[PDB]
A paper describes a structure:
Each GroEL monomer is divided into three domains: the nucleotide-binding equatorial domain, the apical domain that binds GroES and substrate, and an intermediate hinge domain. GroEL binds to non-native proteins through two apical domain helices (helices H and I) that form a hydrophobic collar around the entrance of each GroEL cavity.
We formed binary complexes of wild-type E. coli GroEL bound to the model substrate protein R. Rubrum Rubisco. A 4.4 Å cryoEM map of GroEL-Rubisco was reconstructed from 65,453 particles. Non-native Rubisco was positioned at the level of the GroEL apical domains. The strongest contacts to Rubisco were in helix I, consistent with previous cryoEM studies of different GroEL-substrate complexes. However, we also identified substrate-binding residues located at the C-terminal end of helix I, including M267, R268, and I270. Perhaps most surprising is the interaction with the positively charged residue R268, which was consistently the strongest interacting residue in our cryoEM reconstructions.
Residue numbers in the entry:
A (entry chain N), B (entry chain E), C (entry chain D): 2 to 525
D (entry chain H): 413 to 525
The structure:
Amino acid sequence: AAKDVKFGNDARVKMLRGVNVLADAVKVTLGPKGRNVVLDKSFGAPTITKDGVSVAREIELEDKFENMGAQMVKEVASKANDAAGDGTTTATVLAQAIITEGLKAVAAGMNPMDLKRGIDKAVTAAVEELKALSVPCSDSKAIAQVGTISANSDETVGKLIAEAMDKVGKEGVITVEDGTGLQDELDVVEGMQFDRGYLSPYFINKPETGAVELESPFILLADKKISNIREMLPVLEAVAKAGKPLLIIAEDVEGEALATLVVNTMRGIVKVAAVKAPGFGDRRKAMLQDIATLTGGTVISEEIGMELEKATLEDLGQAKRVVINKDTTTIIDGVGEEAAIQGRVAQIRQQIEEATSDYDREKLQERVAKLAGGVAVIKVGAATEVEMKEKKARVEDALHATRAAVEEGVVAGGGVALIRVASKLADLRGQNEDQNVGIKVALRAMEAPLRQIVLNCGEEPSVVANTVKGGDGNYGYNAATEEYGNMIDMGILDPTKVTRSALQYAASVAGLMITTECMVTDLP
Amino acid sequence: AAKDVKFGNDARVKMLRGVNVLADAVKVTLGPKGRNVVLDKSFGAPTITKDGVSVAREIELEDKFENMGAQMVKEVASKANDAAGDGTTTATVLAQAIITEGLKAVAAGMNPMDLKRGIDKAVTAAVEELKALSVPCSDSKAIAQVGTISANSDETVGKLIAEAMDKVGKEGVITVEDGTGLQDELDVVEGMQFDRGYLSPYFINKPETGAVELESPFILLADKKISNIREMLPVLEAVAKAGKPLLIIAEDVEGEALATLVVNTMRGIVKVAAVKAPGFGDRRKAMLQDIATLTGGTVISEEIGMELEKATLEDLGQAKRVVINKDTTTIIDGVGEEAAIQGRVAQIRQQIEEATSDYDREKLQERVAKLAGGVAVIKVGAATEVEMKEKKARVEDALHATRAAVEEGVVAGGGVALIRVASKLADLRGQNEDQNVGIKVALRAMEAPLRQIVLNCGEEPSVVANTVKGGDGNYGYNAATEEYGNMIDMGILDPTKVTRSALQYAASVAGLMITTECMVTDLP
Amino acid sequence: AAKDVKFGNDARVKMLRGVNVLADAVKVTLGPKGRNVVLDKSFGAPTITKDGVSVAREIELEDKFENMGAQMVKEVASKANDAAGDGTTTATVLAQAIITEGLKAVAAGMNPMDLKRGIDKAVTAAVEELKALSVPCSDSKAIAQVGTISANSDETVGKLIAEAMDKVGKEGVITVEDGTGLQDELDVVEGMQFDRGYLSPYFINKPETGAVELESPFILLADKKISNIREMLPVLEAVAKAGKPLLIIAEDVEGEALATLVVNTMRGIVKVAAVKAPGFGDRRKAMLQDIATLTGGTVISEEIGMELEKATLEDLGQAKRVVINKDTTTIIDGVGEEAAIQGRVAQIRQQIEEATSDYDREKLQERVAKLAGGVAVIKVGAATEVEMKEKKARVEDALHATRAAVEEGVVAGGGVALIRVASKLADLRGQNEDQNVGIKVALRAMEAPLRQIVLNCGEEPSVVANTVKGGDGNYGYNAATEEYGNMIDMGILDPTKVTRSALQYAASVAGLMITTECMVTDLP
Amino acid sequence: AGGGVALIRVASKLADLRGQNEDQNVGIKVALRAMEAPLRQIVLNCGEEPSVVANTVKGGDGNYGYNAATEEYGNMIDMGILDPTKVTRSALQYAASVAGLMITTECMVTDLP
């Protein structure tokens, strides 16, 4: 197909215009005073919302180059959620703030490379300053404060989350499910989570949640390549007869099997999920055996001598629930026997004692920790289903926030930490004038999010920005009360991880984009 | 009338367009490798010329705003010519460089005030360094070298220039006249020069020369306003009867008399020109008295009861020749008697001895210097009239150059000194990013002349400029021979004053441009 | 007035277009096979012609830049006529070829000034080659051969020219006048010719002749500037009363006097011709005195105290006829008495005896020769005025040709000399590829005119071109006979001067044009 | 050596190559001048003025050249900025082949839009 080509100035300015469109469309939601956006729904009624994530997913421009520019920033910003639940809006705002001045500098004419390297130096210094400014949060009381703050001051949810974390350490896996009644329950159950996403978004039965949820699904553990549906005919027939869902845990699925499963999911003929086995090689095999033990199924591999055309519900693994995402997957309430689990635990512990290699010993330590940590599930109870669901959503939000908090302490929110570190790093310099103007650009961008928040409030931005910069420490301007003081004292704060991730990703996109000479795309 | 108004970018871009068009039309003539430019002339065939001054004078753009920019640049750059001979090409090339870079920086969003301040500071530093690098010219040998260089290897012309300089002192006014015979002559005749010029271009009997010349005209000495032509009635009647030209020196001329003289010259009724009386007040009165003594004329005043309507041919002074310019006016070969001249000289000497006040002492000192020995003139003899003509032209140019030399020394030519000082002034810095960028802009800009010259040669301008910058002292690249070496040896020396004035004027125009925000121009 | 400005290739393309149209309109006429061209005449019926000079004179293009190029080429070619009448078409063809090749090379990127230098060096080599190849033209036999060749093989006019040349030596000025009978007459008459043309184009009573002719006009010798018609009142009125024509010779005529004389000529009030005095200063005064002695008039100047306001017909000198050319003026049949002529001749002879320097002796020798050589008149005789007129025109052309031939030898025609030197100059080279390509351009283009003539013959051009190149000496292709052989034997030949000047002028135009980068024209 | 340093050096080494006519000579000059193109382009990508570094490298001999990474000079071999001979030779030869085939193009046949 004939491809249009643009070089230098025109291409970069087109991308900049697209980026400005996206930023103007998204940032308006930022801040407690966040405005509203309306999303056209051709089939039915429109929906109001403030979720920058939703607005971003909806944005798609007409001109190809503008669409290109918008989409790249969308893609990078999405990873803010993958990192720490929230932050996409901050990432996009920083992207616009950097890129505007950066491309202005380019147009004026300076070594774009030197500008990029200066940006990177400034961002690294910013990361160091964030680490210095961070405040740890591991105590139960601080954890509860963070959680309730995230959930809009719900001490009950905060306490529940803190109790779950105490019960299963701060590394265990936590999940949420609907409470049977008004009360709430904190359980301990077998299961395990591993860094594996879904093989195709089509598997998503819960698109609004951006996840895959399955109830009492069968489990398949085939440690080998998968390309042909013919291999899965008997298990598929048995699953259809039973009516329960299926899960596919294999080395990989492609070709005919992949296409057939995709078609079935698209037409909803059968609900089944697939994901690549965690890890690789020998440790992957060991983890698969562990999963079989925990699930009550059986590992099947041609090297062992059994075929997928002979597998039956008896040796197929079974569990009462599982959850899968674009990134991670977890097992809920397996079927494996606790005695067998303990035997496997002792076996792997003995293997650890045998393991002289430090790396392999750490791998086995992680495996045994995952196996023995079980799983903790919190049951959300409310008078009405609506209340239950809202509390569940807030619980997930606070759980993500607390995860990030235990990960990287916490810092004052409202972009206050960003502007504070910006003021601190005012005397950073590079190896050339272009690099130094890059430093200036980086700082001018880091000043943006607070200005946007204030603009949303109504008061003139630069006034409050300068006042806060003149302040120090945790000092800042609370939008909620439209006053000044300490965010930590006022109870507003952000998980340092989100700020770090947003700044780093914004710097990455700016660096990639400022170094674009030729674009190419398909003609209409 | 309704006016078209532009603000900011919409206006500065247009001024940049006009300036760039003018620069592209002019600079091509720079350097010993100057190209050819065809200038239209709606009488017959077009004229090929290499005179950047003529090219600029002819340049004028259709668009109102582009014409505005081009005309203002022309006007200001012309001051370099008026001060130190040629001036124009270097002034325009510089102005273009600084204006382009400054507008690019301003579009880059930098404080224009600080940009202008930095440019001016760099100009100051460059002026000081150039003065330091100046090669003094205080000897007959150096004067002759400069003269022959200016006249393209004319040792005899240089020798004549040196002889005249010695005869009439360095500051002594000098001019040239067509030689009567083959041999050249250096005579001394009574005359005087004062910093005044004609009032209307219509008085220019020799528009090609840009100067007014009259042979044995009459001289008017009325130190009062010329209210009405009634005063000029008997004067013009007697002048027409005598069939002679007439020179008018008056304190002031009103609109009626000015327009009457304008129409008289347009119709050529009488060869009459007007010039402001030198100086003002008492010193003006004294100078007019001295002029009367020199010319044999009579002072006309109401205090003495002597009015113009009663004036006769006797009252007006005479002098065999006269020359006038934009601001330079000289009386040549006055008719007054040496006895009266000596008497006035003695009177002024006694006044000097009586002068307790310094200011008045120096006033009388320049008066006596002006009156001492009158003027020395060059008789440009040649075998044929053509030879006489071009010898006279080149001799006048060399005279201007030698004046500039004896004034402000001399430096390496071809604009090399500009880069020689720019490289040395790299360490200069301002009080913020804006001033720093302005300084760097000026530092880059000064390269323009040499780079344009080498480009005309066709060699790699960047390579040659880098080599010269690596060089030192008067070492440089002779575009004429396409060789390197010390510019002093090959004798390509540019007068210091012309370069200084060109740089100053370019800086002034650049500052006024950058500081401009709004234009008002008539609707096209 | 705003001007349209063009640059670079987009500028020189229009110059090339203009030159191409001019060449395609002129060159076709060149050669014995000259194709007819018909010129517009608003008066009515058009005119068929092959006069390339006329065709060029009548060319004017709509586009301003094409007009510029065509006018420049026309004016430069005009110098071919100025030199020897012929050669204008040859110059135009050479200009077309050189310009096309040079602009093509410039498009190739070759350095323009290096190209120009190569062109000029090759041209100088060709000049010296032709100088070597020249065959002397002198003595009765060669004079008669040249004359009859010029007059289309008319031994009659050839013999007349030879007899006149013998009568009046070599440098003796000769003239052509209408006779009174069938037979012809040679004579010695009093007159003189000086290098001064008409002071206004309106003085050309014979526009077809491009020269002034007056029958027994009065002669005015005013050795002073002439600015006002008031000076010429009495003489003009006396001339009008007498009804005779008037000739004006003055040191300078300008301003109101010139304007009034032009108005009178346009209105036919009085037949007046104006010309500047010869030379300058002392030699000008001496020549004016000699002219007065020859004419019987009196020199008028303020130095003697005699004013033109008192001049009379008796005061003015008289001669039966006078002629003024584009650049030279001649007086025929002066009234000055032989006694006075001998007296002045002896005075100047004594002055020669007192003469010291070779410069003075040569000047005086030239003056005495011009005075004492007299003049000869070719009284064309024939049966009818028509044939008399054609014979007169042929005599004029043959006189020009013979003058040039005796001046600078003579060489074969048909550009065969050009191609011969082109062949001889294969070896030449230069310091760089640009110089070499310039040389090749020069040779190839200089080879063009013979190809054009052949193309007019209807034969294949390159065949004859290479045949001649293979040939040697004066061997060539006689277009009239359509046969090869020696030009000298077949009586085909042209003056050396005409071809030399044509080549030089074409080279000069090519250099000037290729050195063009910027063009400025009035807006259409 | 890499960075087009070998190509520019050889191009320098071919100063006085010649052909049987000026057309061949200009063809050779075109080839040699084109040889420099990669080094000039990479220098431009550095953002600094190309001809400077081009002539600077042409002045030296052996392996002296320009390093983009360090922005400095030295023995390109010692910094390890080097390429296999085969790749550069094949690139030059293929470029020459395609250029010759293109320059020898007179007529064109293709389908309409």
